[PDB]
C-alpha cells in the first residue's frame, strides 16, 4: 500500500515489455524499491519497471 513520489530526470524508452515508459518531467509513483537499480511504479496510466537513476524524489 505504500507509494513514494518521484519525477523523471530524463525520458526513458522501455527496453522490454516489463519496463515502464515515461517522459522527462513526468511524475512516477513508486510502489517497490527492493532492488537498487530497477523499481516498480506507475506513470500516466501504465505500470512497470523503471531505472532508479532516471528519477529524483519529489
Helix/strand layout:
Blueprint: E1 4-8, E2 27-32, E3 38-43, E4 46-51, E5 55-57
Antiparallel strand pairs: 1-2, 1-5, 2-3, 3-4
Cα radius of gyration in angstroms:
10 Å
**How many structural domains can be distinguished in the coordinates?**
1
Class based on secondary structure composition and strand pairing? mainly beta
Q: How many alpha or pi helices?
A: 0
Number of strands: 5
Spatial ordering of strands, largest sheet = 4-3-2-1-5
* Helix content bin: under 10%
Strand fraction band? 35-45%
Kindly identify the CATH topology.
SH3 type barrels
Shape: globular
Q: Whole-Å distance between the termini?
A: 18 Å
Helix-strand string:
EEEEE
- CATH architectural name: Roll
CATH class: Mainly Beta
At the fourth level of CATH, the homologous superfamily is SH3 Domains
Description:
The chain is mainly beta. It has a single domain, classed as SH3 type barrels. Helix content is 0%, strand content 45%. The chain contains no helices and five strands. It has a five-stranded antiparallel sheet with strand order 4-3-2-1-5, with no helix packed on it. The radius of gyration is 10 Å and the shape is globular.
Amino acid at each position: 500500500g505504500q507509494v513514494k513520489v518521484f519525477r523523471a530526470l530524463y525520458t526513458f524508452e522501455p527496453r522490454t515489455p516489463d519496463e515502464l515508459y515515461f517522459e522527462e518531467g513526468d511524475i512516477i509513483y513508486i510502489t517497490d524499491m527492493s532492488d537498487t537499480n530497477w523499481w516498480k511504479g506507475t506513470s500516466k496510466g501504465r505500470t512497470g519497471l523503471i531505472p532508479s537513476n532516471y528519477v529524483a524524489e519529489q
